[PDB]
Design a protein around this nucleic acid. Structure first.
Ligand SMILES: [Cl-]
Ligand SMILES: [Mn+2]
Ligand SMILES: [Mn+2]
Ligand SMILES: [Mn+2]
Ligand SMILES: [Mn+2]
Ligand SMILES: [Mn+2]
Ligand SMILES: [Mn+2]
Length: 276
DNA sequence: GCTGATGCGCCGACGGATCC
DNA sequence: GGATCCGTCGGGCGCATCAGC
């Protein structure tokens, strides 16, 4: 069935107005995405912070259009050293972060271009492009090891300031999170191993799935559709993109949106509203 | 400099069998 | 014998490299 994201809630449970809008988008090739007007959509959305995944773009190749964003003028980019045209993440922000870092512990030697950490006054933001398990699950074991390493890294961040983790976490946590759960249990994104990893992430750090917290029983809400077989027009998709929050931030949570109508990638944007 | 072929990475449709 | 299961097949898009000119 088709899906209509409900209206933006912009006030928290206790009545405080949203003061921070974060948008996250796997753009599936930043240069292509810009040619397909993705930045026009971004300007309409006017987030305070924009997190981008799968930029497939080294920083020297960034289109000039990215220089003409006065409201997102603090920009941080990461791409892998030996696999350019794959991976790549970006974080663009209205206000300057206090600290910025890359990777999950040894980026200087493992230059992977998958994770950016930005510390702000009230919280730490992490954006991630989690490694896909691969066609035929050929890189599932690597993914499991990476999940463990990530969980440990994040636990030693959340012990300081509250954490917001966003991005493409490359798993549909539960059956409600994709259209075809039965046929996909041996597929990247819905293996028991990946689903369990997501569960351990929520429990160990700990974190809450913002969208599912607000909409625990809402089906057909996805953020990815394969380019093939007209899947998006049929809303045959997967929810792979998330905002995960420290429990101490739940009173700040106003809404967690899925921007289903925004084209330019095989993922759609997701947007978080917080009252800080 | 430029194009297009190839390589690499990253699952839903459907035909046949099974359930009762 | 309609619904469900399950395993096989055929397939959109972006970006890198390369041959050719
Ligand atoms: Cl940078
Ligand atoms: Mn709306
Ligand atoms: Mn992609
Ligand atoms: Mn399958
Ligand atoms: Mn040349
Ligand atoms: Mn070409
Ligand atoms: Mn059929």
């Amino acid at each position: 069935a088709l899906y209509e994201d409900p209206p933006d809630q912009k006030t928290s449970p206790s009545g405080k107005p949203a003061t921070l809008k974060i948008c996250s988008w796997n753009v599936d090739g930043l240069r292509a995405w810009i040619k397909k007007k993705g930045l026009d959509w971004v300007k309409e959305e006017a987030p305070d912070i924009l997190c981008l995944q799968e930029t497939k773009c080294s920083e020297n190749k960034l289109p000039a259009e990215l220089q003409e964003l006065p409201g997102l003028s603090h920009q941080y980019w990461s791409a892998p050293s030996d696999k350019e045209g794959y991976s790549g993440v970006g974080l663009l922000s209205r206000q300057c972060p206090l600290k910025v870092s890359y990777g999950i512990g040894d980026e200087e030697h493992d230059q992977e271009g998958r994770v950016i950490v930005a510390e702000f006054d009230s919280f730490v933001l992490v954006t991630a492009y989690v490694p896909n398990a691969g066609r035929g699950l050929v890189r599932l074991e690597y993914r499991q090891r990476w999940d463990e390493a990530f969980r440990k890294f994040l636990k030693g961040l959340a012990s300081r300031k509250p954490l917001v983790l966003c991005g493409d976490l490359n798993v549909a946590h539960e059956e409600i999170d994709l259209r075809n759960p039965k046929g996909n249990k041996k597929n990247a994104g819905f293996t028991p191993q990946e689903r369990q990893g997501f569960g351990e992430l929520l429990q160990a750090v700990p974190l809450a799935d913002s969208f599912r917290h607000l909409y625990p029983n809402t089906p057909y809400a996805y953020t990815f559709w394969t380019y093939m077989m007209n899947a998006r027009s049929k809303n045959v998709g997967w929810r792979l993109d998330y905002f995960l929050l420290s429990h101490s931030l739940l009173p700040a949570l106003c809404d967690s949106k899925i921007r289903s109508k925004a084209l330019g990638s095989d993922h759609c944007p997701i947007t978080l509203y917080l009252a800080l």
